[PDB]
Design a protein around this ligand. Structure first.
Ligand code: SAH
Ligand code: SAH
Lengths: 231, 229
C-alpha cells in the first residue's frame, strides 16, 4: 500500500492535531447530520484542506458548484482575504437557506454571492456575459476570470462542468474536485450508475488533458487538485 | 469513516488516473528500490502541484536521500525557480545528482551536506550568502517553501528554523507526520515518534500558522506561515 491505513484512533489523532473548528461550524455539521443527505457534506478535515489550499493559491475569486447546507463555502469564505469573494451555485433554496443562516452567523455574507438554478446555465451565462449580471456584479464574469473552483454538484454532470470550469479559470487557476473516488465504485466496473459513470469520465478527461496537471488526493471520498497550466 | 478506505485496486485506479511519470523518475525509484525511505509517484505529483499552486521560487528541502522529491520540486519550479537540498549523505545525494544531471536540472539546484540544523542556522545568520547559497537566498524571511523529510527526532528543532526562514504566506510541507500510525499510540515512545508527535503539537498550537494534515503516504502536513496583520 502507498498510503497509510487509517483507523478510528488515528483519525481522532488527526482531528485533535489539525482541526481548529469554530463552534458555529460544528453547529452546522450537527444540524446537517439531522438531514437524510447528511453524508453529502464534507469532513472538517477536508474543510481545513480547502482552507489552506485557498490561502496557498492566493485565490480571490472562487466558484463553488454545489453548496448544500454550506460547510465548504464557509471554509472558502473565511480563508479568502478581506477583498476575496466566492460565488455559490446550487439548485436548492431550502438548503442554501441553511447555508446563509451560517454565513450570517459567521459575518461572511459580504464575501458571498449566490445564484440559485442549474449550474450548467449559471456557468454559461457567466461565460457569455459582456457585463456583469446583478448576482455577479463586483465579483467576476467572462472567460479567464476565476482563480479557483470547487466541484461538488451532481456527479453525472461532472464531465459537462469540466470544459466550462476550464474556460472560466485563469491560466494557473485551480479546480478542486470532490467525490472523485465515489466510495471506491470508480474502480469497480460492475458499478455503472450515471453518477459513477460521470465521475469516471471526468477523471479520464482530466488525466488525458495536457492543458492541466492533476493530483488525486485520498482525502475524504477522493479530492482531485486540477491545475490549469499557463499559456 | 472520515476518509475512504483504500484498497490496492483503488490505489491502482488512482495511479492510472493521475500519475504521468517521466521514465527518468521511474528509473530512480527502481534504482532506490535496490537499496522504502522514498516517496510514491503520487506524493511526487502532489508536491509538484503544490509547488506550482504556491508560486514558490525558493525551496529548501531538508532530507534529500536519492533525490526523488527534489526532482519533483526542481522540475515543478519555473525557469527562475531554485531549490536548496540539505542532506547528511554524500553517498545518496550522489544518486540524486545523477538524476538531476540526467534531467538537466543542476543549474536550478543547490546542495549543502552536513547537519541540516547547522545549515539552516548558518543561512539565517549569514550577512552575505555563503558559497553554497550564493544566488539562492539567505537570512530570515527569504524562503517560499520547505519540504521537511529528515531525521524525525529533530522535527521540533527544524520547526522554529523553518518559520524564521519562511516568508509570511510561505509553506512548510512536512513528511511522515503520521509515522505508520505510531503517533496515535502512546506505548510508542521512540525518539523519532516523540519528535513527530511534538512537532504536530507545536504546529497545532501555533497561532502563527495554519495546518492541514493530509492522509496521503505516511501523512503530509501542509503548514502555512500566516501573513503579519
Ligand atoms: N445541477 C445542479 N446545479 C447546481 N447545484 C446542484 C445541481 N445538482 C445538485 N446540486 C446541489 O449540489 C449540492 C451537492 S452536496 C454539496 C456539499 C457541500 N459543498 C458541503 O460542503 O456541504 C446539493 O445541495 C444539491 O442541491
Ligand atoms: N540531521 C539530518 N540533516 C539533514 N538530512 C538528514 C539528517 N539525518 C538524516 N538525513 C537524511 O535525510 C534524507 C531523506 S529520507 C528520504 C526522503 C527524500 N526526501 C526522498 O524523496 O526520497 C536521507 O538521505 C537521510 O540521510
Amino acid at each position: 500500500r502507498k498510503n497509510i491505513s487509517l483507523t478510528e484512533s488515528l483519525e481522532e489523532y488527526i482531528f485533535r492535531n489539525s482541526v481548529r473548528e469554530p463552534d458555529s461550524f460544528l453547529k452546522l455539521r450537527k444540524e446537517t447530520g439531522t438531514l437524510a443527505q447528511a453524508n453529502m457534506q464534507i469532513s472538517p478535515e477536508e474543510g481545513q484542506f480547502l482552507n489552506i489550499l485557498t490561502k496557498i493559491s492566493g485565490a480571490k475569486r472562487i466558484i463553488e458548484i454545489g453548496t448544500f447546507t454550506g460547510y465548504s463555502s464557509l471554509c472558502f469564505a473565511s480563508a479568502l482575504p478581506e477583498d476575496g469573494k466566492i460565488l455559490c451555485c446550487d439548485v436548492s433554496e431550502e438548503w442554501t437557506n441553511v447555508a446563509r443562516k451560517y454565513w450570517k452567523e459567521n459575518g461572511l455574507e459580504n464575501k458571498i454571492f449566490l445564484k440559485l438554478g442549474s449550474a450548467l446555465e449559471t456557468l454559461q451565462v457567466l461565460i457569455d456575459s459582456k457585463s456583469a449580471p446583478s448576482w455577479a456584479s463586483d465579483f467576476a464574469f467572462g472567460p479567464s476570470s476565476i482563480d479557483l473552483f470547487f466541484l461538488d454538484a451532481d456527479k453525472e454532470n461532472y464531465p459537462n462542468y469540466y470544459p466550462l470550469i476550464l474556460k472560466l479559470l485563469k491560466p494557473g487557476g485551480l479546480l478542486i474536485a470532490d467525490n472523485v473516488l465515489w466510495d471506491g465504485s470508480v474502480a469497480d466496473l460492475s458499478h455503472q450508475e450515471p453518477s459513477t459513470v460521470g465521475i469516471r469520465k471526468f477523471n479520464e478527461l482530466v488525466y488525458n488533458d495536457s492543458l492541466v496537471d492533476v493530483s488525486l488526493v485520498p482525502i475524504a471520498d477522493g479530492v482531485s487538485l486540477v491545475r490549469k497550466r499557463l499559456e
